[PDB]
Amino acid sequence: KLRYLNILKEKLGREPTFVELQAFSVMWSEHCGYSHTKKYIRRLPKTGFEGNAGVVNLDDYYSVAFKIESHNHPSAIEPYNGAATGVGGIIRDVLAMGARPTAIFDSLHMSRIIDGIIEGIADYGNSIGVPTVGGELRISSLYAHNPLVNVLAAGVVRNDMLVDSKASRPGQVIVIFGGATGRDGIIQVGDPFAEKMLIEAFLEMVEEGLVEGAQDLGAGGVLSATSELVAKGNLGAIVHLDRVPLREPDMEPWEILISESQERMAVVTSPQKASRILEIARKHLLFGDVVAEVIEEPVYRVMYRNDLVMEVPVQLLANAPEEDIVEYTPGKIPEFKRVEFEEVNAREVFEQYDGTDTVVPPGFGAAVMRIKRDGGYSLVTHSRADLALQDTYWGTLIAVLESVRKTLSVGAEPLAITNCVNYGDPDVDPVGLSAMMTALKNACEFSGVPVASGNASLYNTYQGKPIPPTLVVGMLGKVNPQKVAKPKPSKVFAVGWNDFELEREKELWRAIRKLSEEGAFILSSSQLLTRTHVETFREYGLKIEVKLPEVRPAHQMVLVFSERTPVVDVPVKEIGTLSR
C-alpha cells in the first residue's frame, strides 16, 4: 500500500489521522478498489436496464437481477462460516436492487470435497428459503492451498420497482437497518434467520414506495455503503455514528464506521418516509435508525455526537488509484493437453443436506426458472481452468462460448453474463490478467452477450505460486418454460466435431438452436457426459448406454437425445440409447 499511501498523503496535504488511515485501508484495498482491474472493466461491453447494472430486462415487465461474488480467503480460513457468509453477502447484494432472491449457484474449486463448504452453502440457503439450483464442483490439487468459492445469486424484480443504487438530491437521508453492529472484521457467523427478516422487511419497504436507493453493507461497513451511495450521485453526506444501532455499546467511532457486521442494509429515502422504514424494521425485529444526511457539497463528514471524526472529499474515498494495463494480443490457439479434474457427482454430494423448483431438475447443465406459465430464464455457471492453465487467453474465451452452448442447449437465448475473475498476483504477472480480461471482452464481442456485473479476486497464490487462472461465467438466458425438453426414452447422437475451430462455433450454435426448437433434449458438457448426468437420468428411471467418442480437451460436440436422427448442417453420429 506504500505507493497508495504517498498518493493519499499528497491528496490530504498532511499525513492522515488514524481514522482516515483505516477508512483508506479499506476503500483502496484491491477488494474495494479494483485498482488493477477497473480499466479492463471499462473495456467490457455492458448492460444495465435503464441505467441499472446487474439488472437485465427479460420481457418488458420483469427483469432479472443477478451477480456472482467470491469468498475465497474467508472460506480457506473457515470453510463453513466463510461459505455461509458469502451466501448471505451475495443474497443481500441482489436484494438491494429490489429483486426477490430466487436462486443460488455456488461454483467451487477445491482439492477435495470440503464438506464444511458444501453444508455452509446448503444450510444458509435452506434457512433463508432460497434454493441452490446449480454451480460447479471442480476438483484438482491445484487448488489445495486456495479453495475458490464463487456464489451467484439471482432474483426477479418488476421493472416499475427497480431500486436505484445511489443518492439523488440533497435532503435525502440514509437509514441503516438489519442486525446490530459489533466488532466484526476489524469470520462472523452470519444468521440466515435475521437475513430472512431483512429480505421481508426490505421488500415490504420497496412495495410501499419507501426506498429511493439502497446498498447492502459488506466490506467496509457503514463507510462504503454511505460513501458509495452519495459518491455515485455526485453528492456528499454527513454521517452520525452515534445513531448506528450497536451490539457492543462501547465501541469507538472508527470501529462503528468500519465494522463488517452481517445482515445490514442502507436505504436512501425522503425524511418523511424514514419513520415508516423504521417501523417496518422493528416490526421484523430488526434494528434501524436514520444515520446520515445527503448534502450538496461533495464532502463526507463523519460525526460522533458533535465531535468531528473525519472529513474528506467523497470522491477521494470512492476512487482508488488506477494501475496501468497491459495490452494483450492473442496468438494462435494451442493443442490442449488434458489436465485432470476428478469425476464427482454433485447430485450425491448435496444429499446429506437437501428435488428443486426448476422446470427440469438440476443435474443436466443449465437450470430453468419459471416466472409465468410461458415466461422464464435460464442460469448456468462455467469455467475451464484446465484449459486456462495452459493458455489463459484461449481457455477463458472458450469458457464463455461453452456458456452460450449450455444456454442454447436448454432452448434459452443468451441475455447477459456475470463473471468472477479469480487470479494470482498481477504485479508479478500483469499479462495473464490481461489475457483473461481481454478474453472476456472478445468472447462477449464474438457472441454478442454483454456483461451485466461481475467481481474480482486477485492475489490468489501460495508461496509465490498462483492458482490456475479461473474466470467463472454465470450466463443468463430467456426461455419459455413450456418449450423446455424433458428427458424421455430416445436415441443418443454426438453432434458437432471432436476438436475446436473458432470459425465453426457459430454453426454449432445454429445447430443446437434448430434441434432444441424441434424439442430435442441436449447436453453440452466438456467431457460430453458426466456422472451427475448419468445419475440424474436414473431418477427418471432411464439408463443411458452409449459409446462416447474420443474428443479433444477443447471440442465442439454435444449429445442430442431424440426419437429421430438429427438433420443439421453439422456432423452427426448415433452412439447409443436411453430407456426403460
Ligand SMILES: Nc1ncnc2c1ncn2[C@@H]1O[C@H](COP(=O)(O)OP(=O)(O)OP(=O)(O)O)[C@@H](O)[C@H]1O
Ligand atoms: N456445487 C454445486 N452445487 C449445486 N449444483 C451443482 C454443483 N456443481 C455442479 N452442480 C450441478 O450438477 C450438474 C453437473 O455439473 P458438472 O459441472 O459436473 O457438469 P456440466 O456442467 O454438465 O459439464 P462441464 O462442467 O464438465 O462442462 C450441473 O447441472 C451442475 O450445475
Ligand SMILES: Nc1ncnc2c1ncn2[C@@H]1O[C@H](COP(=O)(O)OP(=O)(O)OP(=O)(O)O)[C@@H](O)[C@H]1O
Ligand atoms: N470481473 C468483473 N466484470 C465486470 N464487472 C465487474 C467485475 N468486477 C467488478 N465489476 C463491477 O465493478 C463494480 C464494483 O462493485 P463491487 O464488486 O466493488 O461490489 P458490489 O457488487 O457493489 O457489492 P458487493 O461488495 O456485495 O460485491 C460493480 O458494479 C461490479 O459489478
Ligand SMILES: [Mg+2]
Ligand atoms: Mg451492492
Ligand SMILES: [Mg+2]
Ligand atoms: Mg459444470
